[PDB]
């Protein structure tokens, strides 16, 4: 027995994704290709974020990713930032930023 | 029980940063992230089908839903990956 995620060449649970669609009352019926396409999209966006969050992890010389990094990754990326523009990452701080009209003098 | 995308989030982590770990709190955020997007995409998918008097969702919807939800480049890559996972998935046995 081979799993669909294997057939689709994915890390994400194609079966699970599929199970959630039907038990989510999104439609009467669910095509076989939907969960596959979807699982991929979720895996891909997940990779995209760990990727950048990981980078933030090394930037601060740390091997373990924590919320801060995830915040820094998302906000420092114009597209991920827009995607999650109305989401709040608990324990994620804010990007360092001080309005210029407010610093020093000469 | 309480399912979560945790293990898959983790498996993908090692694919990108094999030497980077992830705190539990962070894992919890990634799960909220996956559940969120899932819902948004599924929701849009759902609407599209309803608009067009259709009973089945079906990778067409998931795709148009991605185009409608994901920003620029992020959506470009998303659509291929999906179109790829469905082809690879189909060309098998």
């Amino acid at each position: 027995a081979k799993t669909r995620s294997s057939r689709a060449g994915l890390q994400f649970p194609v079966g699970r994704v599929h199970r959630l669609l039907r038990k989510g009352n999104y439609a009467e019926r669910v095509g076989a290709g939907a969960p596959v396409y979807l699982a991929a999209v979720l895996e891909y966006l997940t990779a995209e974020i760990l990727e950048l969050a990981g980078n933030w992890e090394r930037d601060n010389k740390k091997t373990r990713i924590i919320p801060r990094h995830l915040q820094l990754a998302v906000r420092n990326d114009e597209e991920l930032n827009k995607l999650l523009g109305r989401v709040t990452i608990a324990q994620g701080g804010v990007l360092p930023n001080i309005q210029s009209v407010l610093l020093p003098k000469k | 029980r309480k399912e979560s995308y945790a293990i898959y989030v983790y498996k993908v982590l090692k694919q990108v940063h094999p030497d980077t770990g992830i705190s539990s709190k962070a894992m919890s955020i990634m799960n909220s992230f996956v559940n969120d997007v899932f819902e948004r995409i599924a929701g849009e998918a759902s609407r599209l089908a309803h608009y067009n008097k259709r009973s089945t969702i079906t990778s067409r919807e998931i795709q148009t839903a991605v185009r409608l939800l994901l920003p620029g480049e992020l959506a470009k890559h998303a659509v291929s990956e999906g179109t790829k996972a469905v082809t690879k998935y189909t060309s098998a046995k």
Partner: peptide, 14 residues
């Protein structure tokens, strides 16, 4: 070989 990230990197491996 997996997915292509915007940065150019990919999952490579399964």
């Amino acid at each position: 070989p997996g997915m292509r990230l915007r940065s150019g990197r990919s999952t490579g491996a399964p």
